[PDB]
Amino acid sequence: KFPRVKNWELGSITYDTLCAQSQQDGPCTPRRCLGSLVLPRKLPAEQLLSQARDFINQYYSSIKRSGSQAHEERLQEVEAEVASTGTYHLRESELVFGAKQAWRNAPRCVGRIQWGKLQVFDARDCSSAQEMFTYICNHIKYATNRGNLRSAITVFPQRAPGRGDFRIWNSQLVRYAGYRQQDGSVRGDPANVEITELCIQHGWTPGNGRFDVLPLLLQAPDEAPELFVLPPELVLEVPLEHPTLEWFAALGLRWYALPAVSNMLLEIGGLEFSAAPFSGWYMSTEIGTRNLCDPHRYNILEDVAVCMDLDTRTTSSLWKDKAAVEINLAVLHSFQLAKVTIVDHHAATVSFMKHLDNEQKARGGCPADWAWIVPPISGSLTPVFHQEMVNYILSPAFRYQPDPW
Amino acid sequence: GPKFPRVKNWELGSITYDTLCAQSQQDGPCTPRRCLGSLVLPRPAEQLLSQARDFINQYYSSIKRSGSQAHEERLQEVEAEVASTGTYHLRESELVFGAKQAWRNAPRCVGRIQWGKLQVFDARDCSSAQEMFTYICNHIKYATNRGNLRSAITVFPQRAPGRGDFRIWNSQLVRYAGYRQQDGSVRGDPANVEITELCIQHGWTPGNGRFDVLPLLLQAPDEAPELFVLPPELVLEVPLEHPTLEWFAALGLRWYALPAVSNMLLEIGGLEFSAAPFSGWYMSTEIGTRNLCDPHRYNILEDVAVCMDLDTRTTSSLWKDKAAVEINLAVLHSFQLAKVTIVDHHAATVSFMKHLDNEQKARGGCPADWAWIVPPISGSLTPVFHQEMVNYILSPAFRYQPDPW
Numbered sequence: 001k002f003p004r005v006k007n008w009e010l011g012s013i014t015y016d017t018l019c020a021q022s023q024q025d026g027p028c029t030p031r032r033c034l035g036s037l038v039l040p041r042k043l044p045a046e047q048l049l050s051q052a053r054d055f056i057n058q059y060y061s062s063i064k065r066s067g068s069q070a071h072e073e074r075l076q077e078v079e080a081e082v083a084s085t086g087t088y089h090l091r092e093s094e095l096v097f098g099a100k101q102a103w104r105n106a107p108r109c110v111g112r113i114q115w116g117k118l119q120v121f122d123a124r125d126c127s128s129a130q131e132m133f134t135y136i137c138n139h140i141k142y143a144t145n146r147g148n149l150r151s152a153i154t155v156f157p158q159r160a161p162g163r164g165d166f167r168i169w170n171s172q173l174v175r176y177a178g179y180r181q182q183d184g185s186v187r188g189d190p191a192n193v194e195i196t197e198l199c200i201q202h203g204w205t206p207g208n209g210r211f212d213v214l215p216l217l218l219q220a221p222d223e224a225p226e227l228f229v230l231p232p233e234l235v236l237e238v239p240l241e242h243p244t245l246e247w248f249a250a251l252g253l254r255w256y257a258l259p260a261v262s263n264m265l266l267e268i269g270g271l272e273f274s275a276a277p278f279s280g281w282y283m284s285t286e287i288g289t290r291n292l293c294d295p296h297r298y299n300i301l302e303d304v305a306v307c308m309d310l311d312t313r314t315t316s317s318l319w320k321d322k323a324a325v326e327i328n329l330a331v332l333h334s335f336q337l338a339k340v341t342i343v344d345h346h347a348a349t350v351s352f353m354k355h356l357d358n359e360q361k362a363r364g365g366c367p368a369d370w371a372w373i374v375p376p377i378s379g380s381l382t383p384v385f386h387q388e389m390v391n392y393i394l395s396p397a398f399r400y401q402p403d404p405w
Numbered sequence: 406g407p408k409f410p411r412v413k414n415w416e417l418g419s420i421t422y423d424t425l426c427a428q429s430q431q432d433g434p435c436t437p438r439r440c441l442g443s444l445v446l447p448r449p450a451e452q453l454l455s456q457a458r459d460f461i462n463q464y465y466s467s468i469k470r471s472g473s474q475a476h477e478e479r480l481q482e483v484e485a486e487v488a489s490t491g492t493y494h495l496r497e498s499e500l501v502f503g504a505k506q507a508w509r510n511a512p513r514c515v516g517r518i519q520w521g522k523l524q525v526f527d528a529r530d531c532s533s534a535q536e537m538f539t540y541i542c543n544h545i546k547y548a549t550n551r552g553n554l555r556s557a558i559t560v561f562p563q564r565a566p567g568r569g570d571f572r573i574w575n576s577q578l579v580r581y582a583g584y585r586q587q588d589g590s591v592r593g594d595p596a597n598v599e600i601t602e603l604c605i606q607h608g609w610t611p612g613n614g615r616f617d618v619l620p621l622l623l624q625a626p627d628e629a630p631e632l633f634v635l636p637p638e639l640v641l642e643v644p645l646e647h648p649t650l651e652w653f654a655a656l657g658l659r660w661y662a663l664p665a666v667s668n669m670l671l672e673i674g675g676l677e678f679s680a681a682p683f684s685g686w687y688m689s690t691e692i693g694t695r696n697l698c699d700p701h702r703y704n705i706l707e708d709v710a711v712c713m714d715l716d717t718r719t720t721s722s723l724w725k726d727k728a729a730v731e732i733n734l735a736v737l738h739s740f741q742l743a744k745v746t747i748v749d750h751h752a753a754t755v756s757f758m759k760h761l762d763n764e765q766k767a768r769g770g771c772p773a774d775w776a777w778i779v780p781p782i783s784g785s786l787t788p789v790f791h792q793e794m795v796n797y798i799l800s801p802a803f804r805y806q807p808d809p810w
């Protein structure tokens with residue numbers, strides 16, 4: 001009736017009962033599993049009222065004031081506001097609780113042990129792209145904290161029935177340019193070709209390097225996006241070198257300290273926050289393995305292998321595996337040297353097992369997407385490989401949304 | 406778009422639609438509410454007839470005689486036989502076709518580019534445990550072929566009306582003993598503790614090494630199972646050494662050549678072959694990553710990292726990743742030196758991508774279990790990591806079944 005969940009390394013079993021709290025359908029059916037898909041195909045008063053009620057219930061329960069006078073009266077306010085206006089507004093503490101919960105509920109995040117520690121900036125009094133820019137700079141400054149990174153989210157004004165959304169066009173707050181060449185190849189980050197071209201077209205003067213930090217395209221409702229250059233001093237970067245391989249630094253590779261996602265929608269109690277960028281810190285495999293070694297990213301494996309004089313002629317010398325390990329080591333080494341927060345995939349997955357255990361006792365379950373939780377190198381060397389996981393959508397939630405153009 | 410799952414490759418940017426999933430007649434464990442794709446384990450007159458009719462239609466399509474006189478005569482023959490006996494029997498060529506199709510349909514197999522090349526040993530005349538042993542030995546000789554391995558399956562009599570099943574008790578034809586020690590530790594393969602203890606219960610005199618080959622426990626209908634020692638000359642093994650680390654040979658590690666699953670049930674047109682062991686050749690990660698490095702298997706990572714002089718006190722030295730690469734390289738190198746067929750995870754996943762493309766054209770999709778297809782080291786370094794996959798159950802199929810004890 002409820003899934004039995006087993007860890008195959010330790011032989012232990014739990015039962016997920018939290019999944020019964022889901023009211024939002026994923027992509028799978030009994031005929032076929034679509035759990036490996038990156039995006040869903042997918043991309044009213046009575047229904048808003050019930051999501052609103054359920055969330056306010058979640059909130060008064062968390063502060064143990066469930067059933068109290070304040071609880072009853074808050075349910076009255078939400079109802080009164082919805083019945084008259086078709087929408088409502090959260091109190092700041094509710095917002096803070098909802099933001100933490102959305103992160104707690106995020107199935108693709110291996111960093112959730114940290115979920116209770118989140119600085120929430122209320123930017124709902126934002127009324128212009130210029131104001132968005134100031135809030136975003138304050139966030140970057142707070143979060144970066146000279147390398148001692150602190151989790152944060154900034155929440156811009158919710159979507160409203162009448163008008164366009166507040167949006168940040170960039171997928172992250174820091175992104176390196178990707179310049180398409182005559183010969184179809186890319187200079188810089190192939191993942192950002194399209195945003196790079198949008199920036200240029202809205203007036204940005206492009207450089208010509210592999211690691212040019214992009215400007216931000218910020219959009220206030222029903223207005224053209226505006227371009228804002230991040231002051232170079234706010235964007236902490238880490239030059240990559242290797243503990244033992246001297247030539248590695250001569251690759252001139254680097255990455256930014258702050259992973260801040262800015263294209264996801266935050267849904268809390270039926271309300272939708274179309275711009276609500278959040279940041280934590282990197283797990284090294286995001287940089288070392290994916291951003292640098294994906295064939296459709298910086299694609300440096302071969303280059304590194306040749307520098308290592310590895311036998312490139314044949315897959316069976318495991319040249320790819322050997323080069324990837326060294327690149328992941330260089331990332332860890334460099335971030336440690338620069339005193340910038342980072343976590344390796346072993347430490348991260350161990351803390352996630354602890355999180356799974358915490359959540360079992362607290363909530364009777366934890367929604368997790370095995371394909372995203374298990375790291376991109378050394379999967380079975382981490383405890384999460386051997387752990388069964390149930391994936392489902394709880395609300396508050398972070399969600400994908402269409403690109404504004 | 407088409408009303409079938411859309412399937413994307415994120416490396417190449419290419420898109421397909423899976424129409425083959427419509428042919429699924431059996432539910433997996435997922436629902437709209439929660440994905441359970443990461444679970445290792447899942448869970449007749451009128452029913453049999455339709456399963457039979459379906460398989461016969463499959464057979465006649467595969468030979469392009471769909472709707473033909475022979476086709477309608479076979480259908481009639483099948484229902485008459487079911488009508489008077491409650492069961493029916495496959496023609497030889499139907500068995501060969503059904504076995505290949507069960508392999509082709511197996512979502513957890515990365516080796517399926519080879520599916521059309523299977524030697525099908527028909528053993529449906531077998532009537533004793535002694536004869537099972539002869540068949541199995543012949544299978545082992547043929548499949549091993551002095552290290553030039555050839556895929557094969559031997560099929561024993563199907564399940565019958567209230568009569569007992571043919572079963573091989575061992576989970577594989579080759580398994581190393583796992584001896585529980587006084588201190589609670591295990592000498593040998595911890596995977597095989599239960600089967601080892603069953604062997605001793607049935608009169609096997611145990612050894613005391615890390616790599617003692619187990620005897621087979623074989624069961625003819627309604628008989629206690631009988632014990633048979635494999636003649637050592639039939640069991641090809643590869644001593645493990647490393648191409649540059651000279652001390653690696655001194656570890657005395659080894660693995661057997663022939664991976665041969667013996668506990669699975671082969672289902673064809675409603676008929677159930679409870680003993681139908683099949684074999685191919687290893688992908689190297691199966692030995693060097695899982696069998697040697699799993700914490701609950703030989704668990705050699707630390708020992709090898711110490712020999713390599715790694716810093717095992719901190720996760721961030723990537724000592725685990727480095728040791729695993731070398732163990733994997735030692736597996737590849739040693740199999741190559743010994744002239745025993747093996748495939749590395751790069752070559753294997755490349756060939757699985759070719760298989761995906763052949764099957765798109767031939768059948769409009771391919772059922773695939775992403776968590777199983779992606780190798781347990783170097784995941785995103787292989788092309789399959791970036792390939793979305795649709796998982797569903799087609800028949801003919803290999804299924805898990807209860808242990809006979």
Ligand code: HEM
Nearest residue numbers: 103106108109110111114151152278279280281282283398
């Ligand atoms: C505290 C440090 C954190 C670490 C080490 C971490 C770790 C990770 C990793 C490795 C991923 C997968 C990224 C990828 O493969 O591209 C991820 C995804 C994600 N994380 Fe975290 N996380 C952290 C904090 C946060 C915070 C503060 C939030 C929100 C408040 C968050 C919410 C999410 C969401 C929604 C995803 C999925 C992103 C997507 O689908 O594009 N995480 N996390």
Ligand code: HEM
Nearest residue numbers: 508511513514515516519556557683684685686687688803
């Ligand atoms: C030809 C060489 C082959 C290679 C390299 C290969 C590769 C593999 C690998 C790596 C696995 C996963 C094993 C694990 O993680 O423990 C697997 C599973 C599987 N393969 Fe193959 N395969 C081959 C041939 C075959 C053959 C001949 C058959 C049957 C006719 C077969 C059917 C299966 C099935 C049913 C599974 C799932 C086993 C289970 O769930 O226990 N494969 N294959």
Ligand SMILES: Cc1ccnc(CCCCCO[C@H]2CNC[C@H]2Cc2cc(C)cc(N)n2)c1
Nearest residue numbers: 259260261263264278279280281282283286400
């Ligand atoms: C807070 C935090 C901590 C550690 N890392 C990060 C960065 C996460 C980057 C996730 C980017 O995901 C992109 C690129 N690869 C899969 C794809 C999934 C996706 C698709 C869409 C439409 C939006 C989105 N945010 N994510 C953020």
Ligand SMILES: Cc1ccnc(CCCCCO[C@H]2CNC[C@H]2Cc2cc(C)cc(N)n2)c1
Nearest residue numbers: 445664665666668669683684685686687688805
């Ligand atoms: C033909 C071939 C080619 C390459 N490799 C192989 C070996 C496959 C061995 C798979 C063993 O599976 C076991 C051990 N790990 C997960 C678990 C799944 C499982 C469970 C059960 C009850 C039966 C079974 N056959 N498989 C076979």
Ligand SMILES: C[C@H](O)[C@H](O)[C@H]1CNc2nc(N)[nH]c(=O)c2N1
Nearest residue numbers: 036037038371372790791792793
């Ligand atoms: C197709 C497949 O689902 C896709 O490659 C996923 C696999 N697992 C992942 N896991 C994480 N953390 N991030 C990713 O981008 C991906 N990509």
Ligand SMILES: C[C@H](O)[C@H](O)[C@H]1CNc2nc(N)[nH]c(=O)c2N1
Nearest residue numbers: 385386387388443444445776777
């Ligand atoms: C819990 C998880 O499903 C389990 O550890 C799976 C993951 N992927 C796998 N993939 C393969 N090929 N073989 C396995 O045994 C497993 N184990």
Ligand SMILES: [Zn+2]
Nearest residue numbers: 028033435440
């Ligand atoms: Zn699923």
